[PDB]
Amino acid sequence: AELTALHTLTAQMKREGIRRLLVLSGEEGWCFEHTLKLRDALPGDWLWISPRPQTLLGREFRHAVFDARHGFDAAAFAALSGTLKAGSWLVLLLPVWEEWENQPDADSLRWSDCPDPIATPHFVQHLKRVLTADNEAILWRQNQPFSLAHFTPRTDWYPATGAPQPEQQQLLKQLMTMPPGVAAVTAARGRGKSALAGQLISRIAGRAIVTAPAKASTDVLAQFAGEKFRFIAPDALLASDEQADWLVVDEAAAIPAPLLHQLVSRFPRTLLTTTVQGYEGTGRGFLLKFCARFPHLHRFELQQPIRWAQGCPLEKMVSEALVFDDENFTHTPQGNIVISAFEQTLWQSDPETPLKVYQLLSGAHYRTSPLDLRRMMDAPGQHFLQAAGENEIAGALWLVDEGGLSQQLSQAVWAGFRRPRGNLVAQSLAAHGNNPLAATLRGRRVSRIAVHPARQREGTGRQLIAGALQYTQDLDYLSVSFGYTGELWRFWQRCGFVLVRMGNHREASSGCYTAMALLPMSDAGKQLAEREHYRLRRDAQALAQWNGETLPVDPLNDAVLSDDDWLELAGFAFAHRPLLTSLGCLLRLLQTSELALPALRGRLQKNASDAQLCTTLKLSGRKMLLVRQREEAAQALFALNDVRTERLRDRITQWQLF
Ligand SMILES: CC(=O)SCCNC(=O)CCNC(=O)[C@H](O)C(C)(C)COP(=O)(O)OP(=O)(O)OC[C@H]1O[C@@H](n2cnc3c(N)ncnc32)[C@H](O)[C@@H]1OP(=O)(O)O
Ligand SMILES: Nc1ncnc2c1ncn2[C@@H]1O[C@H](COP(=O)(O)OP(=O)(O)O)[C@@H](O)[C@H]1O
């Protein structure tokens, strides 16, 4: 009856070149029996995808089941959908419809920073609205009437052979006739960007070098490039002297801009591709700023999906359910900007405002992912501020609660004896700062801040921050962790932030060291910030030398061990403070100490590598090298002042909980 009509609709769907969503909501057993009946009725691959701690290689599947009876992994869901052949069904399993909203989500663990699964009602609420706003999705609920609807047909659709499709062929012509320069092809996932690049390398008379951040499937690109495919990771290409007629970079947005701008000037012609939004995509707002960095950039777009018809209701559902649409970056917010704050409860009563805020926040980031949406919707401790124009959002601020850790735990974190999650900056203040009680303080971290690109540099970004200060109290500080650049820091400095830390680990994506800053609000917060800033000024010279980048603070070259220094050195010597976190102090210890300290001196003063040190000192590896460095620090301290060292060791030793 129902299966027979379902078999007929499938032929139509396959003929129309679309995919569709079939929801099975009911008891687990009931749901499963229906997947059994559905597969033998509609033969196909029926890939099953379910949750726990890939096949999206170039694989395509006919029909699939997504098991969300106990957890909903949004990214996986989105990834699966874009892998289904035309005529495919996406069979989504969900818990009893009336119990869906309050049922814990096993997946929530990956993004809630909670110890146990939490319900995610706002997300479910949103899903139900998309799900029942039209009839495109087939909703099959247990003990509820079921009647396959009848859809007005759409034109016959035909798959791609291998020859470039119309939009590709046209882009291919402009690419092959443009004078020397840079071209960027932007588009939603599945529009044939990687194939276009391969088709290009395949058809030019000259050589071409391709590069990419991680080698994101470069497979499709290689397939169309054929024997002419030549890949070189970004950093090894900058270092090499290799040349080519064309430089082809897909997912160029995920590559550090300074490296990219340098690589491009080496090649007469460059093709940049980047997928916009969706799972693991990049924000449209971010893209605007990215392209702006290439003068005389030729921007091109691709709109037609290649493995399904433009209009597929499955793609529309996923885009709506996960908020991948970004048309707002097209319109310019008008008039006076008005700042206001709101809480996560607004999802339930007025979802359009947090929806629009997410659009802007998501569109301004270099990476887009439904993990963020899940977090904003149901994780606890999230708070928002918005900057509204007459009929559109001009800016938004996303804050998250942090700190309030017990004295005992903070100390444990400081010593590095314990490192649980959540409280990113709070814990970092302790683990990388001088105050073992830094994590007991309360504040809110700036998770994301974004201003519409047509409304930047008018003060809305600073007014957003002013609003956060305005609408909240009983907080020790506002904090922010960001990839460092002089421009971005200057913005935070304006907003009143105080730099308290500069990392030593360049972010793979941005290529920047991570900086941390604080906008203090209580006398305790003010002291943490000044104290930490003073410490950074004493470590500036050592940091700049190690990082290869000067820090923007007045350096204090006073090499004299302080009480502050002794505490940290003891933490390094008798606990688990990281070597680099103790860089400034260790260097000051080494300047005063008369001891050989080969492991510390070799690494910090003579540019020896870990491998070389291990061989010269005959250690088994990095682990023992570090243990030896801690023992050397202890010796140096004892050789300077035995009793002070013993008291410090005794004190920090006890901070180990359990
Ligand atoms: C994790 C964290 O969220 S990290 C940081 C990331 N978010 C951003 O990547 C998105 C990209 N950028 C934007 O959307 C922006 O340019 C924002 C957040 C960084 C700033 O907002 P804007 O509205 O342009 O800020 P605003 O105009 O209020 O800047 C105000 C103060 O900062 C200065 N400033 C602002 N932008 C910049 C910039 N790009 N370079 C240098 N200085 C700047 C100011 O002019 C002003 O001080 P002033 O009174 O002397 O003029
Ligand atoms: N002209 C074409 N002919 C045949 N298959 C194609 C063609 N263009 C793209 N494809 C295939 O369709 C899909 C789109 O891949 P892709 O080009 O990498 O789009 P995107 O870069 O936006 O993710 C892949 O499975 C690819 O192999």
Side-chain angles (χ1 to χ4, degrees), residues 541-563:
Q541 191 175 47
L543 259 345
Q545 194 76 95
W546 180 282
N547 277 357
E549 298 200 335
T550 71
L551 281 67
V553 302
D554 297 354
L556 283 180
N557 303 105
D558 304 61
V560 25
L561 296 172
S562 64
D563 285 1

Side-chain angles (χ1 to χ4, degrees), residues 281-284 286 360-368 372 447-448:
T282 71
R284 192 172 192 175
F286 180 93
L360 185 62
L361 268 25
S362 179
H365 220 223
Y366 86 98
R367 180 159 175 287
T368 60
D372 301 312
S447 187
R448 302 290 196 75

Side-chain angles (χ1 to χ4, degrees), residues 439-503:
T440 64
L441 261 42
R442 286 186 160 292
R444 285 184 177 178
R445 180 174 66 88
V446 168
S447 187
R448 302 290 196 75
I449 186 173
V451 172
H452 196 286
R455 285 297 221 140
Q456 294 183 359
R457 285 163 289 270
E458 308 174 28
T460 127
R462 185 185 175 173
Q463 308 191 55
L464 243 7
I465 290 299
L469 249 33
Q470 170 172 358
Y471 300 110
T472 302
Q473 214 224 306
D474 314 345
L475 282 183
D476 294 299
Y477 64 75
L478 233 49
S479 65
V480 62
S481 181
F482 63 109
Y484 181 80
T485 72
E487 299 221 76
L488 191 49
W489 163 231
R490 201 212 150 95
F491 166 68
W492 292 112
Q493 189 179 199
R494 256 358 212 29
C495 300
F497 283 76
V498 179
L499 194 62
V500 297
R501 172 178 196 251
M502 181 71 261

Side-chain angles (χ1 to χ4, degrees), residues 143-335:
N143 303 320
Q144 238 49 274
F146 177 56
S147 159
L148 197 216
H150 310 30
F151 312 97
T152 316
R154 49 182 93 215
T155 118
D156 281 45
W157 175 91
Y158 295 85
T161 87
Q165 289 290 295
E167 269 176 290
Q168 304 186 309
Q169 183 69 195
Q170 183 51 37
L171 243 62
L172 222 33
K173 258 165 51 188
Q174 283 153 112
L175 248 27
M176 294 175 94
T177 64
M178 66 167 236
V182 186
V185 177
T186 184
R189 167 165 311 242
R191 270 56 183 174
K193 297 185 302 293
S194 302
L196 169 63
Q199 299 172 337
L200 174 275
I201 301 175
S202 183
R203 298 172 177 67
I204 56 168
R207 234 73 155 62
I209 284 170
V210 9
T211 195
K215 189 184 293 194
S217 156
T218 196
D219 295 302
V220 172
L221 201 171
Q223 177 193 316
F224 291 81
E227 63 196 317
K228 282 193 178 190
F229 181 68
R230 185 125 194 283
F231 183 100
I232 302 178
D235 288 292
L237 178 60
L238 197 309
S240 76
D241 296 307
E242 327 323 306
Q243 278 166 204
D245 285 284
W246 280 75
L247 169 53
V248 172
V249 192
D250 70 336
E251 294 316 312
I255 290 159
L259 180 57
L260 190 46
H261 285 105
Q262 199 165 163
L263 283 184
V264 162
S265 69
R266 283 199 251 240
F267 301 95
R269 287 181 182 80
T270 295
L271 170 62
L272 268 27
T273 75
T274 162
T275 89
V276 56
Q277 202 83 65
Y279 82 97
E280 286 186 321
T282 71
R284 192 172 192 175
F286 180 93
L287 244 318
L288 250 51
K289 148 212 154 142
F290 179 78
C291 292
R293 293 318 226 195
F294 294 93
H296 309 300
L297 192 306
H298 305 103
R299 284 203 62 178
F300 301 109
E301 313 187 327
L302 236 29
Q303 194 65 77
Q304 198 110 224
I306 116 91
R307 288 193 159 181
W308 60 80
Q310 173 160 38
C312 172
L314 172 61
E315 177 168 53
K316 183 165 175 284
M317 178 277 311
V318 174
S319 172
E320 298 177 303
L322 272 30
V323 199
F324 293 161
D325 54 298
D326 52 9
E327 290 311 306
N328 60 293
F329 288 88
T330 281
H331 306 300
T332 292
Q334 309 291 324

Side-chain angles (χ1 to χ4, degrees), residues 44 98 160 234 519 617:
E98 299 67 45
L519 168 15
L617 274 27

